[PDB]
């Protein structure tokens, strides 16, 4: 008679109501961590680890989910870090409210393919309207655009101070790693900034190290820990005793030739260490291993040798100091040449005190003048929060300098799109106009969440918010009310042009493209079959 599957089958409006409650179970979590009045959470594990964070990606990655519609919204937050980097609480609330308003349409016996086709006409028109209603590029504002866009990202986190201490350190970090490319591409690789953590003084003592901050120790306590006018030798091979390979064995037939082979394992080893040290090299960085026999040659000659450094850290030092990453001997059948003209340069390599640990600093690197940020917090829970908040702040200034276009934040984009799409649904709307009209109400949840978390008036402040944006579209008298946002500290609509509340363009363009595409896949689960777990057979 029925289906003889050994799992479970649920059809109809059961799964159509379960996917909305699965998406609302995720959105109601992250609704309390949006905007400058948002608050952080606690993520406690079974082993006892506590993670205090408010970013939309760190919470949903550590949180376990079971529903298939819940894994779509959790993987939607992971894509926002790679594509944009701060846009990762706002996408989850929009994509869940896109399913909440579309559930009210399919309960009115409206076909979901008209809602899918109605959402594509509203998503492509939202990108078209936001690209024709921008204020200015990065020429008029200058450095004031980079600082004000950085403070908007920090307002939802622990580094949202009233001053410009953390804002100036981010702009000075991205501007110091300007790496040009072919065909006129000024790239800004923000992954080259080594963000370090140390439980020390307050947040106002966060050092901006112009150069690189290596997270390693010297090793042997007989080397000079401060070298002025240093020459960095970046190399990746273990400075240990000469061990033969698997194909080579030592089969001796004469007992007199025994001790000459035993001394040869250290003579070939020390032959490399004398030709890399006679060329003026004082700092040697190694990703392999330097044993206790080879540490004597640096104490005797007065050189610094750092062992077991990361491979991702050696590439950031050799590119910034002009050093060449050498793995072995080379240069056309040469015995030991080392190409001594390709040594790195540094002004000062100094191991400072980082509150009961050792940290090596390189000052200005003499070739590229890179930057590294050492964070200072109260405990380890604040340092993990300060690292995530700084990494999201580095991604904001990266997209502004690459794509010179900013949009007003604080719900100013979602207020203008809530009224333009209602007029867009009336012109060319015959049967898909109800999906475009619900696309505007789903976008209004971003200024609605700012009024809930601020404990302000909800149905009056957003009603006063769209009152200025309606007059900016139907009354062409140059009212300039396209930048009207929210003042959550006062509870009144303010102008985000003069207040300095700036967000990048692709933090809302890619947010509206990812949330609309995720809402289509969850809208097509009218039939769902769940099989039994095959564990013990």
């Amino acid at each position: 008679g029925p289906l003889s599957v050994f799992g479970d089958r649920s059809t109809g409006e059961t799964i159509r109501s379960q996917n909305v409650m699965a998406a609302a179970s995720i959105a109601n979590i992250v609704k309390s961590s949006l905007g400058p009045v948002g608050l952080d959470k606690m993520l406690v594990d079974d082993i006892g680890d506590v993670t205090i964070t408010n970013d939309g990606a760190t919470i949903l990655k550590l949180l376990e989910v079971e529903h298939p519609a819940a894994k779509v919204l959790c993987e939607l937050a992971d894509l926002q870090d790679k594509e944009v980097g701060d846009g990762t609480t706002s996408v989850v609330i929009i994509a869940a409210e896109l399913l909440k308003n579309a559930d009210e349409l399919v309960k009115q016996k409206i076909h979901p393919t008209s809602v899918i086709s109605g959402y594509r006409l509203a998503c492509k028109e939202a990108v078209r309207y936001i690209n024709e209603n921008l204020i200015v590029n990065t020429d008029e504002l200058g450095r004031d655009c980079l600082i004000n866009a950085a403070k908007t990202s920090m307002s939802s986190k622990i580094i949202g101070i009233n001053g410009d201490f953390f804002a100036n350190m981010v702009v000075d970090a991205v501007l110091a790693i300007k790496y040009t490319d072919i065909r006129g591409q000024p790239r800004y690789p923000v992954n080259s900034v080594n963000i370090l953590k140390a439980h020390g003084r307050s947040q106002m003592e966060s050092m901006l190290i112009s150069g690189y901050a290596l997270n390693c120790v010297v090793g042997s306590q007989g080397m000079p820990k401060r070298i002025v006018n240093a020459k960095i030798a970046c190399l990746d091979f273990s400075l240990q005793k000469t061990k033969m390979k698997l194909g080579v064995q030592v089969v001796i037939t004469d007992p007199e030739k025994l001790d000459q082979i035993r001394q040869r394992e250290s003579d070939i080893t020390k032959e490399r260490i004398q030709k890399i040290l006679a060329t003026g090299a004082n700092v040697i960085l190694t990703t392999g291993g330097i044993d206790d026999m080879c540490l004597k040659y640096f104490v005797e000659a007065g050189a610094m040798a750092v062992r077991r450094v990361l491979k991702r850290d050696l590439k950031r030092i050799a590119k910034a100091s002009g050093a060449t990453i050498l793995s072995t001997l080379a240069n056309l059948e040469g015995e030991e040449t080392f190409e001594a003209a390709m040594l790195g340069q540094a002004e000062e390599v100094v191991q400072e005190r980082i509150c009961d640990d050792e940290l090596i600093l390189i000052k200005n690197t003499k070739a590229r003048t890179s930057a590294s940020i050492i964070l200072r917090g109260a405990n380890d829970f604040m340092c993990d929060e300060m690292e995530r908040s700084l990494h999201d702040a580095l991604c904001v200034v990266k997209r502004v300098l690459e794509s010179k276009s900013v949009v007003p934040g604080g719900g100013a984009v979602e207020a203008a799109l809530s009224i333009y799409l209602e007029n867009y649904a009336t012109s060319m709307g015959s049967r898909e106009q109800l999906a475009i009209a619900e696309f505007a109400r789903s976008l209004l949840v971003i200024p609605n969440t700012l009024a809930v978390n601020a404990a302000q008036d909800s149905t009056d402040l957003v009603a006063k918010l769209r009152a200025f944006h309606n007059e900016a579209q139907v009354n062409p008298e140059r009212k300039n009310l396209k930048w009207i946002g929210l003042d959550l500290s006062n509870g009144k609509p303010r102008d985000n042009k003069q207040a300095g509340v700036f967000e990048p363009t692709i933090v809302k363009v890619k947010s509206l493209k990812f949330a609309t595409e995720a809402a289509i896949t969850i809208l097509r689960i009218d039939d769902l079959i769940k099989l039994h777990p095959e564990s013990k057979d």
């Binding site: 109601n28 406690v44 009115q108 016996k109 409206i110 109800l434 609605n448 969440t449 009024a451 809930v452 008036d457 909800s458 149905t459 009056d460």
Partner: protein, 526 residues
């Protein structure tokens, strides 16, 4: 991990707080509204609920379905009590009260998640309800030519729509004619105990009938009932409350005798006590005897020899209907029997309807009661037919004392959305998002008339909002044709107090769900 005291809070109780509590109450009312959602409209199906004992009850009434779900949710019990009060006040407002009260919470469900302290929602719900119950009274039509054939036609149209959405398809013209004729035979009290609805298994719905008199089920008799033939052209009924047995003992009598000459005189006196009571029933014309107390083998054979009929162990609910049918009086003592206490009928026979025997009375013109015998093919079929009969009786019971009727279907629920949206555009403040949300919540009654049979319900609401804003105010949803139609001209009528008590009970239930902010449950459940 937070609460670890030495002395706990109360015992172990959990309590939600704030905005997650209120959405938990609104979404709970949406689940219990699905059990009355598919039972609306003439194209609405019924539901079958089986309990733990295995008893099946198939019905579509809101007062029958919601009482068998065994709902233990605190907020969802509010929608069950308004379905019970609608059956107690009106009788046919049941599925519409539960579903409309759930829409009052779902239309404010995006509003309660974003601010909007609920004292503004309670004030807006009470304001829109008082304007809704006043526009019904100002538009409900009435007549000034009653006590004629036109008033009986008004009672028949309200009973056909009350018999709609039931298990009756083509028997609307047959059953609803009997419902109007049932309440017109009653007195000026309209008591529901003055009409017997008895279910006889076997026969179609066309085999049912409305007896002008009464009829009982012919309960357990004794030897002598195959005699006493059932042909009476003008009998008299003796309603009694006495025992006609030889063993009538007062349970405290000790008859101490001394000799054998007086011992036989006691046994002869015990037969003379019973035979003197039978001589009082005799010599008075009372050929039919009815008593709620049992009759032994002695008085059964005495009436068979004197060509008299009797019936013992009659239920007390049937003797009260028998007293108002024949116009007599129940006499406990047989010494005061006369012509003023006996009944009078014309046709009294014992038929064989459905296999079981039934002693029916007919022919009495001064009949203040009636009996509607139901014939069906199943026990659950006749229980639904009895439940559908009570909804048509309680509609026509209230229609006599208040003949103000309105249009059926979604005609009133759509035009109340017109008068409330026009009122919401004339007041400032936050009430434009609440009075207008109250008007959009009333549009689900024409939605469930269409969603149960397709009908393209999105396009049919654009025709309803355009017709009510242009011309008449009684345009609703046609069931046979997939179009809008004037329900007042199509004789789809319902009394005005059906929708007045529906809007009043749904608003007071919706104001109670939004007013509770904490729910504390004690774990002691024994």
């Amino acid at each position: 991990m937070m609460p670890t005291p030495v002395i706990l809070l109360k015992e172990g109780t959990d309590s939600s707080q704030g905005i997650p509590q209120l959405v938990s109450n609104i979404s709970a009312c949406q689940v219990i509204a699905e059990a009355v959602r598919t039972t609306l409209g003439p194209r609405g199906m019924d539901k079958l609920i089986v309990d733990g004992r295995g008893k099946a009850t198939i019905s579509n009434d809101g007062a029958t379905i919601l009482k068998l779900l065994d709902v233990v949710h605190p907020a969802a019990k509010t929608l069950v009590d308004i379905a019970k009060s609608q059956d107690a006040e009106v009788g046919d407002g049941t599925t519409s009260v539960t579903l409309l009260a759930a829409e009052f919470l779902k239309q404010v469900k995006p509003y309660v998640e974003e601010g909007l302290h609920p004292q503004i929602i309670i004030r807006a719900f009470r304001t829109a309800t008082q304007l809704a119950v006043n526009k019904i009274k100002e538009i409900a039509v009435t007549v000034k030519k009653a006590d004629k054939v036109e008033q009986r036609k008004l009672l028949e149209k309200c009973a056909m729509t009350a018999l709609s959405s039931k298990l009756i398809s083509q028997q609307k013209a047959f059953f609803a004619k009997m419902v109007v004729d049932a309440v017109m035979m009653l007195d000026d009290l309209l008591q529901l105990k003055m009409i017997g609805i008895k279910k006889v298994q076997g026969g179609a719905l066309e085999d049912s009938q409305l007896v002008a008199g009464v009829a009982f089920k012919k309960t357990f008799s004794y030897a002598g009932f195959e005699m006493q033939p059932k042909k009476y052209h003008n009998p008299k009924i003796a309603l009694l409350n006495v025992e006609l047995e030889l063993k009538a003992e007062k349970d405290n009598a000790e008859i101490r005798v001394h000799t054998v000459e007086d011992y036989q005189a006691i046994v002869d006196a015990e037969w003379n006590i019973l035979y003197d009571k039978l001589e009082k029933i005799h010599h008075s014309g009372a050929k039919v005897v009815s008593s709620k107390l049992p009759i032994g083998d002695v008085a059964t054979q005495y009436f068979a020899d004197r060509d008299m009929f009797c019936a013992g162990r009659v239920p007390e609910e049937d003797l009260k209907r028998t007293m108002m049918a024949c116009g007599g009086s129940i006499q406990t003592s047989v010494n005061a029997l006369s012509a003023d206490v006996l009944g009078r009928c014309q046709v009294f026979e014992e038929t064989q309807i459905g296999g079981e025997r039934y002693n029916f009375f007919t022919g009495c013109p001064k009949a203040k009661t009636c009996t509607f015998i139901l014939r069906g093919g199943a026990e659950q079929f006749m229980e639904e037919t009895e439940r559908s009969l009570h909804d048509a009786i309680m509609i026509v019971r209230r229609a006599i004392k208040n003949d103000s009727v309105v249009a059926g279907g979604g005609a009133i629920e759509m035009e109340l959305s017109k008068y409330l949206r026009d009122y919401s555009r004339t007041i400032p403040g936050k009430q434009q998002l609440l009075i207008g949300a109250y008007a959009k919540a009333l549009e689900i009654i024409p939605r469930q008339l269409c969603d149960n049979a397709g009908f393209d319900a999105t396009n049919i609401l654009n025709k309803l909002r355009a017709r009510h804003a242009q011309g008449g105010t009684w345009y609703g949803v046609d069931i046979n044709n997939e179009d809008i139609a004037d329900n007042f001209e199509a004789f789809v009528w319902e009394p005005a107090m059906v929708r007045i008590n529906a809007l009043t009970a749904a608003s007071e239930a919706a104001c109670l769900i939004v007013s509770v902010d904490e729910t504390i449950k004690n774990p002691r459940s024994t």
